[PDB]
Ligand binder design. Structure first.
Ligand SMILES: CO[C@H]1O[C@H](CO)[C@@H](O)[C@H](O[C@H]2O[C@H](CO)[C@@H](O)[C@H](O)[C@@H]2O)[C@@H]1O
Ligand SMILES: CO[C@H]1O[C@H](CO)[C@@H](O)[C@H](O[C@H]2O[C@H](CO)[C@@H](O)[C@H](O)[C@@H]2O)[C@@H]1O
Ligand SMILES: [Ca+2]
Ligand SMILES: [Ca+2]
Ligand SMILES: [Mn+2]
Ligand SMILES: [Mn+2]
Lengths: 240, 240
């Protein structure tokens, strides 16, 4: 289909169109990307991702069209630790994408250690909300919590300072306009605090015509829950 | 998802989200539900169906919600003859639906011979565009071409006389309103000729909470092409 849209105001346990990978599962009408014990407390060494089952037609070589898409979602992070890790990301990748071996912790379940910073070895666009930046392990990160745009590498092509707020929901709108090739990210907390970051990228040179969209999160030695609360997505092929 | 929508203005050959059953295949940017020869001419004894891969949440027992839905599509029928058969139908059924054994010809690939008129043995709602009504084989049909609403039986609960026009595209709009429980069908030819048929039905007592939507067509001894040219669908779970 040239156009596709879907909306999850909440996430009931009865799901049919979501692909669950790793430890991701539904609990209390929300998606818990990372594992939690019986009491709902976060645990270390966990990775989980979800993908919508239907493939999205991102661009069409034959017709020279590229999709205009928008992804709106909200999530919350919670941890009794002073340095919860590692973060959550909205991503777009080839339909057969699976969790890379050893992609835990700071790799957010998106990249393999050996090629995490090799742009020619990956096919993924992601918007990360990174809460762990220890310069000793996450050497590629700026020294503060941040929102980053990742294009085929864990070392973001761009980042902006972000404030992690325990237990508070962050509303995010990610948009891509094929006319300007601008990928815009706008995130807000309920008190009006706003974060914005944009990057120009030709998705045709990074991703295949058909892709899947979803979320990924991970916790290494440090941990926190990564709770996806709602998600709506829409895409439509347009003439460029 | 509480809401889902998709649109196929045309049908390019590289499809990813369509389930093809029987003889259905893409040819010339359109879906040919029934088999055709090398020169594109219709052949006898053929059945074909397509279903969208993502499941639709028609109703939810927990929230007591029921979805409204709208399906818009256009198709054309062509035959060297005139008594083209057998017809095409838009249908909704359980996700694991497959072509029933011996459902060719007048059964439109939707019902099994032994239970075609047994409402307690089927789970399907369909809007049929029936062009063959010979009483020797289609005893359940009125004596003329027609559009009918089928609820668990090949014997339509409601029909309206219809005119078959070789090679002309018929634009159809099917809508279900959960508030009134009315399933409305409006079909029109380019010159404005309009056909309307409606029926009140509680989808909750006929179909499971999750379903798949699609099209089916068949040709027994008489034949014609059943070409699906475009299709858009949208559904939203609502409180009533
Ligand atoms: C206390 O953990 C920090 O220090 C440890 C010892 O140097 C590191 O092993 C550890 O790295 C792992 O956890 C972080 C945070 O979850 C993660 O980003 C990294 O990829 C490792 O999984 C961390 O630096
Ligand atoms: C000439 O075909 C008509 O008469 C035949 C002899 O009685 C029938 O077998 C035949 O029925 C089959 O074809 C029709 C039209 O395709 C179909 O509706 C029916 O299910 C049988 O397949 C038809 O009545
Ligand atoms: Ca990090
Ligand atoms: Ca018939
Ligand atoms: Mn980072
Ligand atoms: Mn009929």
């Amino acid at each position: 289909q040239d156009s596709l849209s879907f909306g999850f105001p909440t996430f009931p346990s009865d799901q049919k169109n979501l692909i669950f990978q790793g430890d991701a599962q539904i609990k209390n009408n929300a998606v818990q990307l990372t594992k939690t014990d019986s009491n709902g407390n976060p645990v270390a060494s966990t990775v989980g991702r979800i993908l919508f089952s239907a493939q999205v037609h991102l661009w069409e070589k034959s017709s020279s069209r590229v999709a205009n898409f928008q992804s709106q979602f909200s999530f919350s992070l919670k941890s009794p630790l002073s340095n919860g890790a590692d973060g959550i990301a909205f991503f777009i990748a080839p339909p057969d994408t699976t969790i890379p071996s050893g992609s835990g912790g700071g790799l957010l379940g998106l990249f393999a250690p050996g090629t995490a910073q090799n742009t020619s070895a990956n096919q993924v666009i992601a918007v990360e909300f990174d809460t762990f930046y220890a310069q000793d392990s996450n050497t590629w990160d700026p020294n503060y919590p941040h929102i980053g745009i990742d294009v085929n590498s864990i070392r973001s092509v761009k980042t902006v300072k972000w404030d992690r707020r325990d237990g508070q929901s962050l509303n995010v709108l990610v948009t891509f306009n094929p006319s300007t090739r601008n990928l815009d990210v706008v995130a807000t907390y309920s008190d009006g605090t706003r974060y914005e970051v944009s990057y120009e990228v030709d998705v045709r040179s990074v991703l295949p015509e058909w892709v899947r969209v979803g979320f990924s999160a991970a916790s290494g030695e440090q941990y926190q829950t990564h709770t996806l609360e709602s998600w709506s997505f829409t895409s439509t092929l347009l003439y460029t």
